[PDB]
Amino acid sequence: QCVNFTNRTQLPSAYTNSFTRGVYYPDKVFRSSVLHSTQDLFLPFFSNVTWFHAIHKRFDNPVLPFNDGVYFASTEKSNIIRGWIFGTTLDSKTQSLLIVNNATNVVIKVCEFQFCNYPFLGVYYMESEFRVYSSANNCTFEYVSQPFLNFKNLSEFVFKNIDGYFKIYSKHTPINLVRDLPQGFSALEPLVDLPIGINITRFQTLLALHRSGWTAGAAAYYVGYLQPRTFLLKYNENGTITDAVDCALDPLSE
Amino acid sequence: SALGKLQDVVNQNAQALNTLVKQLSSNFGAISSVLNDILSRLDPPEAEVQIDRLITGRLQSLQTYVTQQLIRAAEIRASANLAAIKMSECVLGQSKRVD
Amino acid sequence: QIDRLITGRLQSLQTYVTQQLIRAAEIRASANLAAIKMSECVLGQSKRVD
Amino acid sequence: DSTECSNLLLQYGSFCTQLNRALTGIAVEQDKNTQEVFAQVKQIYKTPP
Amino acid sequence: DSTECSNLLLQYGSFCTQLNRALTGIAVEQDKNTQEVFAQVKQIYKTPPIKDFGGFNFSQILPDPSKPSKRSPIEDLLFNKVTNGLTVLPPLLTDEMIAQYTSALLAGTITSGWTFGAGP
Amino acid sequence: TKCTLKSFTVEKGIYQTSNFRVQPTESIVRFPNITNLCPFGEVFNATRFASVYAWNRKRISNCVADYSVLYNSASFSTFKCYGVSPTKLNDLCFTNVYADSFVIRGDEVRQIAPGQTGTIADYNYKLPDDFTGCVIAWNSNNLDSKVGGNYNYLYRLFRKSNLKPFERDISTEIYQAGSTPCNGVKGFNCYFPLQSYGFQPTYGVGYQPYRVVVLSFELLHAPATVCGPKKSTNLVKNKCVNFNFNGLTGTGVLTESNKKFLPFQQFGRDIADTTDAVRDPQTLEILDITPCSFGGVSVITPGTNTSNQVAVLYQGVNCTEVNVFQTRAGCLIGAEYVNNSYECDIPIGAGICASYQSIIA
Ligand SMILES: *[C@@H]1O[C@H](CO)[C@@H](O[C@@H]2O[C@H](CO)[C@@H](O)[C@H](O)[C@H]2NC(C)=O)[C@H](O)[C@H]1NC(C)=O
Ligand SMILES: *[C@@H]1O[C@H](CO)[C@@H](O[C@@H]2O[C@H](CO)[C@@H](O)[C@H](O)[C@H]2NC(C)=O)[C@H](O)[C@H]1NC(C)=O
Ligand SMILES: *[C@@H]1O[C@H](CO)[C@@H](O)[C@H](O)[C@H]1NC(C)=O
Ligand SMILES: *[C@@H]1O[C@H](CO)[C@@H](O)[C@H](O)[C@H]1NC(C)=O
Ligand SMILES: *[C@@H]1O[C@H](CO)[C@@H](O)[C@H](O)[C@H]1NC(C)=O
Ligand SMILES: *[C@@H]1O[C@H](CO)[C@@H](O)[C@H](O)[C@H]1NC(C)=O
Ligand SMILES: *[C@@H]1O[C@H](CO)[C@@H](O)[C@H](O)[C@H]1NC(C)=O
Ligand SMILES: *[C@@H]1O[C@H](CO)[C@@H](O)[C@H](O)[C@H]1NC(C)=O
Ligand SMILES: *[C@@H]1O[C@H](CO)[C@@H](O)[C@H](O)[C@H]1NC(C)=O
C-alpha cells in the first residue's frame, strides 16, 4: 500500500550552521588526557547544514544523496521520526537497507524492497499504519535490537559505509532551545556496526503521521555531508572527548 | 619563559624519544609494521623481504636518532664547558671580563 | 622504481641535513666566539693575551 | 607534484617533519647568532657633528 | 622478541654495537659534564649558625632547613617551575647532592671570598 | 665482560655487558563470552522433517555456531564433510549457513555428494561440484516409519532435465514421457512426478528412512559474522604472559587498573600509541598492561690484577624479578651496602658507588 501526500505547502528548505557538531569517536580505543590527531570522514566545523521542518503544513521527505556519509540531526519531541531508508535505486532491482524504530523495538533488514514513493508510518489518536514497501523478496541480514530513541530531545546520528561496514554513531542530548541547533560540543558514541555489504548512494527519512486527513507533529531535522579530513581530539581524564579542532578550517586551527 | 633553555632541552629530548617510538608504527613500504602479522600471514621467502624492509627502515631511524643525539650532546657539552668556566671565573673569583 | 628514487633522494636529503647541522654547530661556535670578542674587546679593554 | 610518490612517501613516517624541524632550528639559530653578536646595546648612540 | 628478525639483523654486522657505544659515550659524558660544572671543590663548606654578615641577607640562596630536600627557596622555585627497548639511566649525582655542592660553593664564597678557589 | 671488552684483562670499572628480559611464561587467550547460540535445535531436533523434493532450507545468520556439539554426538551415522574439515569448523567463520533438511532412503545417502548420479541428484536435490559444507545423516526408523505405512514422504521420479545445484522443484505437473499431451490425466505414457516411500519399521537398512541435514558454508565479499566459538584460557595476573584479547595480541604483565573505561571502549593507548590498558571480554574489568621487564646487565669489577670478584647491576629492574640490594639505578647482586660514605671508585648511579676493600656499595 502506498499513499500520495497532496496537501503540502511549497517552501524552500533552509540552511544553518553546523557549529562544532558531528564529531564522533573514530575507534573503540580508550585514550585519557591526550591530544590525538585522526584523519577520517568527518563533518566540517561551521559548515552549511540543510534544515528541514515538519510543522502544521510542512512534510519534508525529499530524495537526498548519501555521498561518503550522512550526519543526521533531529530536534525532536513526541517521537515523530521513526527510521531511515538506504540504497541506490530504492526498488527491487538493487538491495536496500531498512532501519525502523516502532513502538516496541528497532529492526534492521537488508532486502530488495519495492519501496513506495512516499514511505511512512502512522499513529492513530497507537500505531496502526505502516506503508513503506510493497514487497521483500531476497533478505540477507536481519538485526532486532533495543529502541534507540518546545523541542526537548536532540538525537544525532552519523551513517557511514566503508569496506562493507555500516557504522551508525548516536548521541542523545537533553536541550531546551526553541528553534535552532544549540552551540556546544558533544562527541557521538558509536551505536552499531552492521555487516550489510551493500552499495548506498541515496537515503530517505521515515516520518510518522498523526491521525485524529493527516497532521504532522512538530519536528525538525538537519542533513550534513561528511568529507575526508583531519581532526585534533582532546581526551580528558575520564576518556571523554571534550573538545575538537578542525585541521583545515582556518589558519589558527591549522 | 624564564627557564626556557632547560625546558627546551627537555622538550627536544622527549620529542626525539617520541618520534623514535612513533617510527615503529611505519611499515617503510612493507605490508605491515607489525612483525607478528608478517610472520603469521606470509611464507618465509617473502616474509624475509618484508622483515628486511622493516629492519632497514628502523635501522635508518635509529641511526638518525643517534646522529642528532650526538649533535645535541656536543651542544650540551659546549654549554657545560661554558658553565664550568663561568663557575670557575664568576663564582670562585672576580672576573674583569666584560659581560 | 619510485621507491628506489624515494630512498635515494631521502638518503641524500638526510646527508645534506647532517652536514648542515654540523656546519651550524661550527658557525654557532664561531658566533659565540665573536660575541665574546664583541663584549670583551669592543665594550671593554681585555687583559687576555692575543 | 606526483601523488603516487607522496602516497609511497607517507609509508616512511615523519622523516620529512624531522628534516624540516632541523632546518627550521638552524634558520632560527642563525638569527639568534646575529642577535648575540650585534645586538648587545639597547641604545643607538650617535657621534657628535 | 622475533628470532627471525634478529637472525636477519645479524647480517648487517656491528651497527647495533656502534649505536650502543655512542649512547653509552653520551651517557657518561652527561655525568662528566655535571662533575665538571658542580664538583669543583673537595671541601664541603658550611655557613656559621649566626647569619651576621653586616646586613647582607642570603636566606633566599642558602638552603632552607625546613625543607626536606635541603634546597634554597630559589632552587626550590626552579625545581617547581621545570616540568620498546628504551631505558633512562639515573644521573650519578642526585639533585640533593648537586644542591649540597652549590651550598658548599655558596658557603665558601660567602665566608672566604675567592680564597677557597685558589687554596685553603 | 672479557668477551665484551675483547681482552683477558679487565680494568677497574663498570661495563655494560648484556641485557635481561623477563621471558614470557604463559599464553592467555581471552575472547568474548559464549552467548547467542545458533538455532541448531530447531533443525536437528525437529518433530517432523520435509520430503526430499520440498526440502526445508533454513538460513542461519548473526549468531554463534558450535559445531563440536554435532561432531561429538554419537547419534549420527554419516558426518561426511566435503571441502572443509570438521576440526577447523569450530575455528573458521562464515557469512551464512544454509541448513537443508530432508528424508531419503538408506541407499540414497551416497548420492548426496559432489559429482554423483542417481534419481535424487538428477531430479530431487543436486549438490554442486564446488561445494563446501557437511552432509549429516542419521537413521529415523523409529519416528518416520509406521506399521500401516508412512506415505507422507515423496520424491520426484521424473523431469525433462536435470536439476541445477540448490534448486527446489515443488511443481505437481504431469510428466510427459510421450508425444501425446497428458492434458492433466495420468493415462498412457503420462505418469505422476511425486512418488511416496512407504516407510515401514520392518524394512532393511538400505531402505529405512534417513534424516539428512546438509550444512552449506559459503564465503561472500560481505564480512563473515557466523563465527565458531573460541575458548577462554584462565586469566593469569601479575606475570609476564602472552595475551590475546579479541584479536589484539602482545606480551605483558596484566594487573588491575583504576581507569574507568566508557562502555564502548575496549583497548587503551598512551601518548606514544602503545597499548597500555585493555578490557577483558569475559568479565568487564579493566587491566593495565605493563611491559615485561627489560634492563641492561652491567658488571662491576676491580682490576683482574687485584681480584676476580664481580657484581651484577640489572638496570631499572626490581630485585624480585631476577648479597642482593635494591638501588634506584636497579638491582645490585654480589655487593653489600655499607652505611659509611667514601669517595666514588666505581660509579653505579643515583648517588651509589662501588669499591673493593669484598665489593661494597
Ligand atoms: C505517488 O506519486 C508517485 C509520483 O508522482 C507515483 O510514482 C509514479 O508511478 C507511476 C505509475 O503509473 C510511474 O509511471 C511514475 O514514473 C512514478 N513516478 C515516480 C516519481 O516514481 C506513485 O505511484 C504514487 N502512488 C500511488 C499509490 O499512486
Ligand atoms: C632575611 O630575609 C628573610 C626573607 O626576606 C627574612 O625573613 C622574613 O622575616 C620576617 C620577620 O621575621 C617574616 O615576617 C617574613 O615572613 C620572613 N620571610 C621569609 C621569606 O621567611 C629575614 O628576617 C631576613 N633577616 C635575617 C637576619 O635572616
Ligand atoms: C548555504 O547554502 C545556501 C544555498 O545552497 C546559501 O544561500 C546560504 O547562504 C549558505 N549558507 C552559508 C552560511 O554559507
Ligand atoms: C515492530 O516491528 C516488529 C518487526 O516487524 C514487530 O514484530 C512488532 O510487532 C512491531 N511492533 C508494533 C507495535 O507494531
Ligand atoms: C532475487 O529475487 C528474484 C525474484 O524474487 C530472484 O529471481 C533472484 O534470483 C533473487 N536473487 C538472489 C541473489 O537471491
Ligand atoms: C554504487 O552505485 C553508484 C551509482 O549507482 C555507482 O556509480 C558505483 O560505481 C557503485 N559502486 C559499487 C562498488 O558498485
Ligand atoms: C571525571 O570523573 C570524576 C569521577 O570519577 C569526576 O569527579 C570529574 O569531575 C570528572 N571530570 C570531568 C572533566 O568530567
Ligand atoms: C537433539 O537430540 C539428541 C537426541 O535426543 C540430543 O542428544 C541432542 O542434544 C539434541 N540437540 C542437538 C542440538 O543435537
Ligand atoms: C560471562 O560468563 C560468565 C560465566 O561463564 C559470567 O559469570 C559472567 O558474568 C559473564 N560476563 C558477561 C559480561 O556476560
Residue numbers in the entry:
A (entry chain A): 14 to 69, 77 to 145, 153 to 176, 185 to 247, 257 to 298
B (entry chain A): 943 to 1041
C (entry chain B): 992 to 1041
D (entry chain B): 745 to 793
E (entry chain A): 745 to 827, 856 to 892
F (entry chain C): 299 to 620, 641 to 675, 691 to 694
Paper lines:
SARS-CoV-2 utilizes a trimeric spike glycoprotein for attachment to the host cell receptor angiotensin-converting enzyme 2 (ACE2) and for the subsequent cell entry step which involves the fusion of host cell and viral membranes. Given its crucial role in the viral replicative cycle, the spike protein represents an important therapeutic target and is a critical antigen in host immune responses. All emerging variants contain defining mutations within their spike proteins, with multiple mutations clustering within the receptor-binding domain (RBD) impacting both ACE2 binding and antibody neutralization escape, while mutations within the highly antigenic loops in the N-terminal domain (NTD) across these variants reduce antibody neutralization. Given the rapidly changing mutational and antigenic landscape of the SARS-CoV-2 spike protein, a structural understanding of spike protein mutational effects and the discovery of broadly neutralizing epitopes is of importance.
To identify structural mutational impacts on ACE2 binding we next determined the cryo-EM structures of variant spike-ACE2 complexes. The resulting maps were obtained at average resolutions of ~2.6–3 Å. All mutant spikes exhibited slightly higher affinities for immobilized dimeric Fc-ACE2 when compared to wild-type. We did not observe major differences in spike protein expression across the variants, and all mutant spikes tested demonstrated marginally enhanced ACE-2 binding potencies relative to wild-type. These complementary assays demonstrate that the totality of mutations within each variant S protein enable slightly enhanced ACE2 binding, suggesting a contributing factor for the increased infectivity observed for these SARS-CoV-2 variants. Superposition of local RBD-ACE2 complex models revealed no significant structural changes. These structural findings confirm that mutations outside of the RBD do not modulate the positioning of ACE2-contacting residues at the receptor interface via allosteric mechanisms. Our structures of VoC S proteins in complex with ACE2 demonstrate minimal structural changes in the RBD, reflecting its functional constraints in cell attachment, only permitting mutations that preserve the ACE2 binding interface.
